Amino acid sequence: VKVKIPEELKPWLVDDWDLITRQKQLFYLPAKKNVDSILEDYANYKKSRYAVNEVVAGIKEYFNVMLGTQLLYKFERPQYAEILADHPDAPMSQVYGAPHLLRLFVRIGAMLAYTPLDEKSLALLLNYLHDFLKYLAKNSATLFSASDYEVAPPEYHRK
Amino acid sequence: VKVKIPEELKPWLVDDWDLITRQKQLFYLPAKKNVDSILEDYANYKKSYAVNEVVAGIKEYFNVMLGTQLLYKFERPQYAEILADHPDAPMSQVYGAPHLLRLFVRIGAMLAYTPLDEKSLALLLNYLHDFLKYLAKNSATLFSASDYEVAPPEYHR
């Protein structure tokens, strides 16, 4: 329902897909900069001077639900199975980082399927999500990088 | 967001849980009557904007929640098969009424995050309750131990 990925983040979406799907790398897990910390940075940043705490809590919950169903490429499913077995009940927002978070925003525009019941609340939320995406975009040099990935070893492929 | 399931459907909820968790049966997949058709059935029944949003929203939440929220442990391997036997197939195309009903047990917690004034929220709850009323009304046809089968000894392995 009109969640726009900043144009400057599209190349990264392709690089992320390439790293996982073509190069058979995996994001290094558990994350050096997890979704929880990224959301806390954002909330702190906005709090510098029905608001941020709600947005951030909402993003984290949808992330924690959708990661295992929507935001993984096929090649990542074993790694994800391992995570649950190693860190059970530990929320995904504690394990994954920025790349998978970005992937949420490419799909979250569908959850926004009751909010068009409330045109005004929608607008405000869309403004927050776009603001957050722009926060990720301008911070891309730290958040999105091939340095957070590692080629999966031959044992990973075996399964 | 307190979603009340019709009293009529609570015994099925237990039976469903019994069939999977005690009897070690699995719902027959893919469903002879999937979430998409049920959603379609309901929309037709209503029409004869909010209904459309409600139905789309039901589907979205089902597709997102199924694999991490709506399954008992014993069902996990079947779901992994599903993800192989039917890739790119949304869950709403594969699963049927039982799981759809389990959603209404979980979605209250999820929608507790979306932004809803007192009116939009109540309006949502009313339509959700109205869909549940639709499920109860068609219970004999939608919820049945006959859609379940004992799992093979190999599934156990």
Coordinates of C-alpha atoms in Angstrom, one line a residue, chain A residues 3-15 102 106 130 133-134 136-138 140 144:
Chain A
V3 CA 5.8 1.8 1.1
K4 CA 8.6 3.2 -1.0
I5 CA 12.2 1.9 -0.7
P6 CA 14.6 4.7 -1.0
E7 CA 16.1 4.5 -4.5
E8 CA 19.6 4.5 -3.1
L9 CA 18.8 1.2 -1.2
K10 CA 17.7 -0.8 -4.3
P11 CA 21.2 -1.7 -5.4
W12 CA 21.8 -3.2 -1.9
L13 CA 18.6 -5.2 -2.2
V14 CA 20.2 -6.7 -5.4
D15 CA 23.6 -7.2 -3.7
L102 CA 15.2 -4.0 5.0
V106 CA 9.6 -4.8 0.8
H130 CA 9.5 6.3 5.2
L133 CA 13.8 3.9 5.6
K134 CA 15.5 7.3 4.9
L136 CA 18.5 3.4 7.0
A137 CA 19.4 4.8 3.6
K138 CA 21.6 7.7 4.8
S140 CA 23.8 2.6 4.6
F144 CA 24.5 -2.7 4.6

